[PDB]
Design a protein around this ligand. Sequence first.
Ligand SMILES: *[C@@H]1O[C@H](CO)[C@@H](O)[C@H](O)[C@H]1NC(C)=O
Ligand SMILES: *[C@@H]1O[C@H](CO)[C@@H](O)[C@H](O)[C@H]1NC(C)=O
Ligand SMILES: *[C@@H]1O[C@H](CO)[C@@H](O)[C@H](O)[C@H]1NC(C)=O
Lengths: 37, 50
Amino acid sequence: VIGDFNCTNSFINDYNKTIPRISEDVVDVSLGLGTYY
Amino acid sequence: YGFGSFNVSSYDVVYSDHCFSVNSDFCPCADPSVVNSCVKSKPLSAICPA
Ligand SMILES: *[C@@H]1O[C@H](CO)[C@@H](O)[C@H](O)[C@H]1NC(C)=O
Ligand SMILES: *[C@@H]1O[C@H](CO)[C@@H](O)[C@H](O)[C@H]1NC(C)=O
Ligand SMILES: *[C@@H]1O[C@H](CO)[C@@H](O)[C@H](O)[C@H]1NC(C)=O
């Protein structure tokens, strides 16, 4: 998946379909967010 | 995917002529379980990484 080295297999719930809601927000740069020196 | 070495004389340098970039999910082998009904153009196959 991420890599291709099978590290472990304990407690792998591979029976589901629900990609969950993540979150959303709005980036507001009015005070200095997202800038650098 | 299996690059061993350059087996040439040790005073000659190597240079390419074409760069082919691929995506992060590449494998040059076909699926062997979906070839059992074909007669013509049967390719060599293996088990690709996850
Ligand atoms: C991954 O490794 C564990 C322990 O080494 C093993 O029990 C499991 O079967 C492996 N998974 C696969 C798909 O080979
Ligand atoms: C999907 O996950 C939820 C919990 O996150 C579980 O209740 C549900 O049974 C899972 N669906 C399936 C088909 O197993
Ligand atoms: C390197 O090895 C390959 C296969 O063993 C052979 O085809 C090739 O001619 C070799 N190169 C030299 C310079 O011996």
